[PDB]
Design a protein around this ligand. Structure first.
Ligand SMILES: [Cl-]
Ligand SMILES: [Cl-]
Length: 162
């Protein structure tokens, strides 16, 4: 198990424009296109991301390419974040993957805002961080996914994904 397979599990794969759980325009493996209500604005962002007139549909390869870029961006965003880098450097390899997963889903600002939980993670107080991470909109809106992420932080194994 690694970050790519983990996220592929949590986000799925769709070759056609679709709405995420919040109702936003998305494509591929969780690649948010836009937060605007317009399908057209979405088609436009897609074409621009792919580099061609797509018509709301992409190939598997295209999807995997967006995916690789987004995982890369997530990691780099963590290292560039003053609040995130420290937690991340403190963690083992599995737990690091759980951090990247939250980041990829909720944006860096998003995560950087879980102040108390980040502190708990850094202190290695697993069980407490889990409880604290659960008191969030993030958990309430996508509970089964959040649950997987949280177990990963709690245990340090890939058990929730196996
Ligand atoms: Cl892009
Ligand atoms: Cl869920």
């Amino acid at each position: 198990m690694n970050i790519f397979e983990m996220l592929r599990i949590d986000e799925g794969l769709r070759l056609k424009i679709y709405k995420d759980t919040e109702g936003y325009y998305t494509i591929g493996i969780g690649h948010l296109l836009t937060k605007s209500p317009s399908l057209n604005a979405a088609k436009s962002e897609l074409d621009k991301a792919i580099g061609r007139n797509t018509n709301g549909v992409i190939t598997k390869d295209e999807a995997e390419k967006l995916f690789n870029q987004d995982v890369d961006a997530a990691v780099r965003g963590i290292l560039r974040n003053a609040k995130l880098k420290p937690v991340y450097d403190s963690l083992d390899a599995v737990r690091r993957a759980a951090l990247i997963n939250m980041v990829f889903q909720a944006g860096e600002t998003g995560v950087a805002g879980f102040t108390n939980s980040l502190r708990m993670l850094q202190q290695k107080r697993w069980d407490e961080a889990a409880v604290n991470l659960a008191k969030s909109r993030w958990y309430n809106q996508t509970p089964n996914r959040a649950k997987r992420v949280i177990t990963t932080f709690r245990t340090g194994t890939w058990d929730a994904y196996k």
